[PDB]
Amino acid sequence: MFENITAAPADPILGLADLFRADERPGKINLGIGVYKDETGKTPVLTSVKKAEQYLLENETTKNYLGIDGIPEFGRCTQELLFGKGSALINDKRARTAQTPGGTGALRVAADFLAKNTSVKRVWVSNPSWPNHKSVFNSAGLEVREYAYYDAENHTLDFDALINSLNEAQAGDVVLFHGSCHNPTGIDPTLEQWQTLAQLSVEKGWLPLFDFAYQGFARGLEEDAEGLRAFAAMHKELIVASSYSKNFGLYNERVGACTLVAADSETVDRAFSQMKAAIRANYSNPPAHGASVVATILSNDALRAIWEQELTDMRQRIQRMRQLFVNTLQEKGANRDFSFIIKQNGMFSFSGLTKEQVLRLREEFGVYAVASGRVNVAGMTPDNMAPLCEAIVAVL
Amino acid sequence: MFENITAAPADPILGLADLFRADERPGKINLGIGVYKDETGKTPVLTSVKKAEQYLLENETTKNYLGIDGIPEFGRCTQELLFGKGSALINDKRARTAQTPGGTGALRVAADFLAKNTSVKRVWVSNPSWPNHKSVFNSAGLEVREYAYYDAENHTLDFDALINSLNEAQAGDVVLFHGSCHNPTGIDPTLEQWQTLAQLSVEKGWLPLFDFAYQGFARGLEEDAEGLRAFAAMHKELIVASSYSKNFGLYNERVGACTLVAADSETVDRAFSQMKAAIRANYSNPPAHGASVVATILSNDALRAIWEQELTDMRQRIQRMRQLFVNTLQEKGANRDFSFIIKQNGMFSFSGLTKEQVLRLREEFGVYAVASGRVNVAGMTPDNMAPLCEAIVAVL
Ligand SMILES: *Cc1c(COP(=O)(O)O)cnc(C)c1O
Ligand SMILES: *Cc1c(COP(=O)(O)O)cnc(C)c1O
């Protein structure tokens, strides 16, 4: 059977690694993958997680199976973090959440539930968007249509074109929104812009699917949730897939959740059982470690306070590197205004680079950026900040 | 969209929990789920894993993403544990393995790879078999046909009927074999019987898919692998899905692997990339914790020695409870020969009970067994062994 088999192509992001990693070149700079990197260029494990991990080590008595939906406590916390502390969705029992292996596994679990218990056959994903999106949905048999998003000339959210590609989306179709820190543009809708998409969506009969993979990285944990919350106030049904990989630095432990809100308790209970049936057929129940770490930190007021401070530092370091980037460029010799990257948020930014400029840095200079022209700012330090803006003014 | 939605039915195994758990009855006995239980009725975390876990805690420097296939070291070990220390499949580079979220996730990853890169459309699964099998494969779009297996009268492997249901399986179809400790019968083929299925399968053009979820629980770690190894000696292509949940007591951490052997290096490399593409579309990369625990124990000669001793004790306790069961029954008052359960292996056994006897114990007696008449012997202690055989001679 395997004699026919065609080789799979490169993952748009993860293929660059084996080129930096395997580049035997000395003075490199990575700037590719969306994994945070501190002042020293290390991706350390948070202090609050080290503390929750010795705690688990002292207290775990069994490795016995978690429920299909996982740790109850982890469920509750994800809900409060998302909908708010006194949220009516929580009070009316309209939300149900399942712990999943990553934000990607919550996306896929949403995919398989929709693709077999529902009308939907089409998912609208922005242009551009996180590459693996299309691939997850298509794997469920659904098809990916892409509304417009970004003004390649003004480096902003082309709102009009956004609305003007969305009306082609008919009712009972799913529209996918990045909750905060849009991957890869970093451009996010204003609150007014969300209050608008909220009504166009209620009026047009859409099913919103929020991808929350960076809560806390744009402005705050509550601020970054205002859009989802604006949509959750007027829709009776919506789903949200979230990830704790980047905001807790728990990347390789695979922790995320897929919450489903329905019109009421009876419906979300009944719809959740099918979501559960979907999980039981994929991976049987979720991995305990990274989830219990998150449940412990969030449940304990001493540990949680350290966690938010750590998140606040990661956020404040990226916010500082962005400014270091636009200034060093302005000093190294640039005939181009990169001030827009200062207005963008999260770990990523779309430089104004062509696929041939990206290739010119990577070859003649060893600096690595996805062909997309996307550079991870949380991978710039004050130390590498100089050979970086030198390479960029050379290629400009 | 969710107003239509039909409630999902009960999982054949996991629905009984909420009935024992939620049974407010006092003198209970569970006997349902396939999770080991020691002399005290506790599912403790192994000593060798507690030791590997403090080790990870002292040494982990980052929670950064694992490769799509996971921990290399974990890959190598799974191969040697399966194929053997000086195995030619390993030496010729014909094997490739991906770490997955459980044995169930290795089954599913096999499913999705086959269902989209291959000819196969049918999977042969024994009668009976682990319930979730059918459900995983059907989820991939494939269909489940079931060959015969068990002689409900002689409590053995009906070999002839086995062969006589298998010829209907045409070439390019997948036949699924339990490597050791057949769930739920506990009846396993002899080595001669495997050397026979090995040639019928090479002669008929089948694709073997081994489900290894209990290596070490029948006779040993190497002994329990003789069948797979007999098949791997004469087939050029085969896949095997294994789980470390029960044999390392790592249930809720989701650790298993999906190995793929092809005719040669070039083919397995090329076929593996597609397997990888399948993973990247499900859950992005695997969970690190439970896998690194397994890699550490197996890599270290001091830790490994404790691990095998622990496995040896679990194995020897079940082997003793089986004998306690046939003897206590023979003394409590039984007009039936249960000696067959002494000849069966692993955690499970098919009592000779009717769905109405199972229901009679569970109601009038609080003893819980799946309607299947399957009782987990690794859930019997010398303490509960008496009200157990009393209930069974009452219902007989
Ligand atoms: C990182 C990311 C995710 C999910 O990542 P997981 O590692 O699988 O949690 C989802 N969406 C976007 C835009 C992301 O950047
Ligand atoms: C337990 C089991 C598996 C896999 O279980 P995971 O918890 O997902 O590893 C596979 N096959 C059988 C027969 C089993 O009993």
Q: Is A242 in the pocket of ligand 1 (CB under 6 A)?
A: no
Interface size between A and B, measured as CB pairs under 8 A = 220
Token look-up 């999705």 returns: B112
Q: From the options 3.40.50.300, 3.90.1170.40, 3.90.1150.10, 3.40.50.510, give the CATH code of A11-44+316-396.
A: 3.90.1150.10
**Given its phi and psi angles, is residue A104 left (phi above 0), alpha (psi -120 to 50 degrees) or beta?**
alpha
- The finding on whether B106 has its CB within 6 A of some atom of ligand 2 is no
Whether the CB-CB separation of A111 and A139 falls below 8 Å is answered with: yes
List, as ranges, residues 67-106 from B with C-beta within 8 Å of A: 68, 100-102, 104-105
**H/E/C letters for each residue in chain B?**
CCCCCCCCCCCCCCCCHHHHCCCCCCCCECCCCCCCCCCCCCCCCCHHHHHHHHHHHHHCCCCCCCECCECHHHHHHHHHHHHCCCCHHHHCCCEEEEEECCHHHHHHHHHHHHHHHCCCCEEECCCCCCCHHHHHHHHCCCEEECCCCEECCCCEECHHHHHHHHCCCCCCCEEEEECCCCCCCCCCCCHHHHHHHHHHHHHCCCEEEEEECCCCCCCCCCHHHHHHHHHHHHCCCEEEEEECCCCCCCHHHCCEEEEEECCCHHHHHHHHHHHHHHHHCCCCCCCHHHHHHHHHHHHCHHHHHHHHHHHHHHHHHHHHHHHHHHHHHHHHCCCCCCCHHHHCCCCEEECCCCHHHHHHHHHHCCECCECCCEEEHHHCCCCCHHHHHHHHHHHC
Ligand 1 near A243 CB (within 6 A): yes
Does ligand 2 lie within 6 Å of residue B34's CB atom?
Answer: yes
> Shortest CB distance from B287 goes to which of A62, A112, A289?
A289
**Residues of B that are catalytic:** 130, 211, 246
Tell which residue, B368, B374, B371, has the closest CA to residue B391. Answer: B368
Please indicate if the annotation marks A130 as binding a ligand.
Answer: yes
Interface of B with A in 310-329 (CB under 8 A): none
Asked if A207 is an interface residue toward chain B (Cβ–Cβ < 8 A), one would say yes
Q: What ligand is nearest to the CA atom of residue B241?
A: 2
Q: Is the peptide bond before B128 cis (omega within 30 degrees of 0)?
A: yes
Are A392 and A386 in contact, with CB atoms under 8 Å apart? no
Q: How many CA atoms lie within 13 A of A76 on its CB side?
A: 10
Q: Indicate the residue of B119, B251, B287 with minimum beta-carbon distance to A1.
A: B119
Per-window interface: B 249-288 vs A, CB < 8 A: 249-254, 260, 262-263, 267-268, 270-271, 273-274, 276-278, 280-288
Q: Hey, is the C-beta of A381 within 8 angstroms of any chain B C-beta?
A: no
C-beta atoms of B139 and A102 within 8 A: no
Measured CA to CA in angstroms, residue A18 lies from A132, A143, B266, B274 at distances of: 19, 31, 19, 18
| CA dihedral for A93, A96, A97, A98, sign (positive or negative) | positive
DSSP assigned state of A285: S
- Tell whether residue B249 is among the known ligand binding residues: no
- Check the annotation: does B34 bind a ligand: yes
| Inter-CA distances, B301 with A117, A199, A383, B130, B298, Å | 50, 63, 43, 34, 7
Cα B184 from Cα B33, distance rounded (Å): 11
Q: Which CATH number fits domain A45-315: 3.40.50.1110, 3.30.830.10, 3.40.640.10, 3.90.470.20?
A: 3.40.640.10
**Cα separation of A190 and A184, whole Å?**
17
**For residue B211, how far is its CA from the centre of ligand 2 (angstroms)?**
8
* Pick from A101, A102, A120: CB nearest B1: A120
Beta strands in chain A (DSSP E): 95-100, 122-124, 143-145, 150-151, 156-157, 174-178, 207-212, 238-243, 256-261, 348-350, 374-376
Chain B residues touching residue A70 (CB < 8 angstroms):
none
Q: Where in chain A is the domain with CATH 3.90.1150.10?
A: 11-44+316-396
Is B253 in contact with A285 (Cβ distance < 8 A)?
no
